[PDB]
Symmetry: C3
Subunit: 115 residues, 3 copies
């Protein structure tokens, strides 16, 4: 079975370091919250970034924590008026027998308003 894991986190400046730092933190927490201690069962990980962020690919933060074998893809989020700014969102596809209602999703910082 495949279960999606959602995550979201905000930053306060479109810089490679800031983008990477937040992404690394989110990915590590999404995995920790679900007791995942290996990357072998992640089918793929998809990232989306709001329009106000274009300095670096979030996928690079995944490479930084050793996810070089995990398929990654990034896309742009819809610029909805009044929507939360500077947000990095993640959708991990996890091969697991963990029930849908047992999967833990992670919303950090300002993204907590998105849960």
């Amino acid at each position: 079975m495949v279960r999606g894991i959602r995550g979201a986190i905000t930053v306060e400046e479109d810089t490679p370091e800031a983008i990477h730092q937040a992404t690394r933190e989110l990915l590590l927490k999404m995995l920790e919250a679900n007791g995942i201690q290996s990357y072998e069962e992640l089918a793929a990980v998809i990232f989306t970034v709001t329009e106000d962020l274009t300095s670096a690919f979030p996928a690079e933060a995944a490479r930084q924590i050793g996810m070089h074998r995990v398929p990654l893809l990034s896309a742009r989020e819809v610029p909805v008026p009044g929507s939360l700014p500077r947000v990095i969102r993640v959708l991990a596809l996890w091969n697991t027998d963990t029930p849908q209602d047992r999967v833990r999703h992670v919303y950090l910082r300002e993204a907590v308003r998105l849960r």
Copy 2:
């Protein structure tokens, strides 16, 4: 086994009401057409909207019909000039043994012309 389910529907205007109503109808039809019993079978659902739609997130319609525990993600479609305007597209990833040739995709309203 995971099978993707595609859906597409158009709206006549860029308003939250129009977007949510259409997305709600599309999702319900996608579920109905494939006889899906519980949302527990859905690994995730991805939504995309064309550049001319920015008033709201289609994913909100999913919450309206009880998909609170289903992982949702939204993105922007490639802005190809001359393409069908105001389109909401959906890709559901379904855990099922259903063969690929038996999965039912749904194309509504003006998107009916987008069916493969």
Copy 3:
């Protein structure tokens, strides 16, 4: 299980013919590299294209090679300084027993500069 397969290829110019030819080449190469002789194994295929490519949908290429029954979805890639121009990226979700470490990803033409 489900394993994602990554692919990427560049195009010399923004025209439907060029986009479709490149996408056909990449898709075929991704399947060949993984010994996939049938499309029944593909859960879905997601494409992303850089903003300098807007003349056509890469998904049309999938139809051309007979992937009508494969669920397809496309999205806009995130702009990044110094990133390779005119890039088509693919993420195929493959139903397979193949371990993550044995899935073959394909980077063609100038896209080799991204791998």
